[PDB]
Every structure is written in structure tokens, then in C-alpha cells.
Design a protein around this motif. Structure first.
Motif, short mmCIF file in Angstrom:
data_model
loop_
_atom_site.label_atom_id
_atom_site.label_comp_id
_atom_site.label_asym_id
_atom_site.label_seq_id
_atom_site.Cartn_x
_atom_site.Cartn_y
_atom_site.Cartn_z
N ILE A 5 83.57 17.09 27.80
CA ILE A 5 84.34 17.52 26.67
C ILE A 5 83.48 18.48 25.87
CG2 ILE A 5 85.71 16.80 24.67
CD1 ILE A 5 85.96 14.07 25.84
N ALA A 51 82.31 19.98 22.16
CA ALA A 51 82.22 19.58 20.78
C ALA A 51 81.55 20.67 19.97
CB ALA A 51 81.45 18.27 20.65
N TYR A 96 79.16 21.15 16.85
CA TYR A 96 78.19 20.56 15.93
C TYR A 96 78.39 21.13 14.53
CZ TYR A 96 73.52 18.68 14.74
OH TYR A 96 72.46 17.99 14.21
N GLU A 134 78.56 5.09 20.80
CA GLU A 134 78.49 5.39 22.23
C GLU A 134 77.47 6.47 22.50
OE1 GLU A 134 78.85 3.25 24.43
OE2 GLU A 134 79.69 4.69 25.85
N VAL A 148 75.61 9.35 24.75
CA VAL A 148 75.97 10.45 25.63
C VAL A 148 74.89 11.52 25.59
CG1 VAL A 148 78.47 10.12 25.49
CG2 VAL A 148 77.29 11.54 23.79
N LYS A 149 75.01 12.51 26.47
CA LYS A 149 74.05 13.58 26.51
C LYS A 149 74.75 14.90 26.39
CE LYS A 149 70.83 10.94 29.28
NZ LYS A 149 70.27 10.75 30.64
N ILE A 150 74.15 15.78 25.63
CA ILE A 150 74.79 17.03 25.26
C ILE A 150 73.76 18.15 25.29
CG2 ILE A 150 76.44 18.04 23.66
CD1 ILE A 150 76.56 15.46 22.14
N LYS A 151 74.21 19.35 25.59
CA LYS A 151 73.34 20.49 25.58
C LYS A 151 74.09 21.71 25.10
CE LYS A 151 74.15 19.62 29.60
NZ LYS A 151 73.65 20.45 30.73
N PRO A 166 66.16 24.69 27.84
CA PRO A 166 67.09 23.83 27.10
C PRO A 166 66.88 22.34 27.39
CG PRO A 166 68.18 24.69 29.05
CD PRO A 166 66.75 25.16 29.11
N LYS A 167 66.94 21.54 26.33
CA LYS A 167 66.83 20.10 26.46
C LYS A 167 68.22 19.48 26.47
CE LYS A 167 62.76 20.24 23.42
NZ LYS A 167 62.17 19.66 22.18
N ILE A 168 68.29 18.21 26.84
CA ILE A 168 69.51 17.46 26.69
C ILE A 168 69.38 16.56 25.47
CG2 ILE A 168 70.15 17.51 29.14
CD1 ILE A 168 67.58 16.15 29.09
N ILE A 169 70.35 16.66 24.59
CA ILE A 169 70.35 15.87 23.37
C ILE A 169 71.15 14.60 23.60
CG2 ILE A 169 70.65 15.96 20.86
CD1 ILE A 169 69.02 18.28 21.97
N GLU A 170 70.75 13.54 22.94
CA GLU A 170 71.50 12.30 22.98
C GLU A 170 72.07 12.01 21.61
OE1 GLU A 170 70.24 8.97 25.75
OE2 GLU A 170 68.32 9.98 25.46
N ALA A 171 73.33 11.62 21.58
CA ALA A 171 74.02 11.34 20.34
C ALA A 171 74.85 10.07 20.47
CB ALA A 171 74.92 12.51 19.97
N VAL A 172 75.13 9.44 19.35
CA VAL A 172 75.99 8.29 19.29
C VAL A 172 77.31 8.64 18.59
CG1 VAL A 172 74.23 6.50 19.48
CG2 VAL A 172 74.73 7.50 17.24
N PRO A 191 73.76 12.70 16.65
CA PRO A 191 72.60 12.74 17.54
C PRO A 191 71.56 11.69 17.19
CG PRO A 191 72.61 14.64 16.06
CD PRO A 191 73.94 13.95 15.92
N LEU A 192 70.63 11.50 18.10
CA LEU A 192 69.50 10.61 17.88
C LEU A 192 68.29 11.46 17.57
CD1 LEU A 192 70.09 8.10 20.80
CD2 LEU A 192 70.78 7.88 18.41
N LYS A 236 67.92 15.00 15.32
CA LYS A 236 68.60 15.92 14.42
C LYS A 236 68.42 17.37 14.86
CE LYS A 236 69.78 18.22 10.60
NZ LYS A 236 69.75 19.69 10.46
N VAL A 237 69.53 18.08 14.86
CA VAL A 237 69.56 19.49 15.23
C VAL A 237 69.92 20.33 14.04
CG1 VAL A 237 70.24 21.10 17.04
CG2 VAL A 237 70.57 18.65 17.40
N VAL A 274 78.64 22.94 22.54
CA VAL A 274 77.95 22.01 23.43
C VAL A 274 78.93 21.33 24.39
CG1 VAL A 274 76.08 21.51 21.80
CG2 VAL A 274 78.19 20.18 21.72
N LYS A 275 78.40 20.90 25.54
CA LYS A 275 79.15 20.10 26.50
C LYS A 275 78.54 18.72 26.61
CE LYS A 275 80.90 23.83 29.41
NZ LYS A 275 80.43 24.67 30.54
N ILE A 276 79.41 17.74 26.71
CA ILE A 276 79.02 16.35 26.69
C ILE A 276 79.08 15.77 28.09
CG2 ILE A 276 79.20 14.29 25.27
CD1 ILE A 276 81.60 15.64 23.87
N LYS A 277 78.11 14.95 28.39
CA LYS A 277 78.08 14.22 29.64
C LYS A 277 77.94 12.74 29.36
CE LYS A 277 77.52 18.20 31.97
NZ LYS A 277 76.43 18.09 32.98
#
Lengths: 69, 69
Positions: A5, A7, A9, A26, A28-31, B2-8, B16-17, B19-20, B28-31
Motif C-alpha cells: 500500500i 502512504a 508521511y 502493527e 511493517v516496513k516502509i521505504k 535507502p534504508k527500510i523504515i519500521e513503523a507501527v 515509525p519507530l 523518526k523521519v 513510501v511503499k509498505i511491506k
């Protein structure tokens, strides 16, 4: 499917584009989505059959005389 | 790089876990990390040329030789 999906920011929070099936907290991972392609390398031009290659056409006169006495 | 960000995702928001500091509505795309589904066994073995495809019996006419005078 393991769906992606999108999103946006906003101000420090990721706000979807279309709803997500996740619960509160929940993980998840985002880039940040990227562009461009990698580098490409191709095999250099070679000699093709259509190129002028010389043949080895030999020619003799086939001598057939004989000195008499 | 590029890194992968983690968010709740809390209450419909991705928090995010880490902060950006980007724009509002940054793309962004979510996985969702997924588990792999295993496979079962496929079809049985086939019949090859050396496997003898069918019966291998044929009639020998035996020896009759030759007769002369």
C-alpha cells in the motif's frame, strides 16, 4: 496477497492511500520509493560471416611433358 | 543508499519507530513481512528409453542355415 500500500508521511506520520488491514501497533516496513535503473554491459561487435573473408583458392597448371632422348 | 523504515500502524496511522524528517505526504511503499508457504511432492517418475517402455519379446526364426550340393 502480501500487498503493498502507498502512504504519505504527513508531519511525522505515515498516512495511507487506501485503508490497511492492520491493527493498532502493527509493525511493517516502509521505504521511500526510488527511480532509475542499474548499469548495463553488452558484448562488443564481432566479425560476422557477412564480412569479407579471403578464401584459399590454389591453382596449378599440372605439367605433363617428358624430355625424350 | 535507502534504508527500510519500521513503523507501527496505530488507529489508522503509521507511526515509525525511527523518526523521519521529510515532507508532508512523502511517498513510501509498505511491506508486511510474510511467511513462506512450502510445497508438496509432484508427479511420479516417467518412462525412458532404457526403462523399457513396453514388452521386449520378439520371435526368433532360429537357425535354418544353408544347404548345397
Amino acid at each position: 496477497m502480501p500487498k503493498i500500500i502507498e502512504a504519505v508521511y504527513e508531519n511525522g506520520v505515515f498516512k495511507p492511500l487506501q485503508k490497511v488491514d492492520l491493527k493498532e501497533g502493527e509493525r511493517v516496513k516502509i521505504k521511500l520509493e526510488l527511480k532509475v535503473e542499474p548499469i548495463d554491459l553488452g558484448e562488443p561487435v564481432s566479425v560476422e560471416e557477412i564480412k569479407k573473408i579471403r578464401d584459399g583458392t590454389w591453382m596449378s597448371s599440372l605439367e605433363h611433358h617428358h624430355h625424350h632422348h
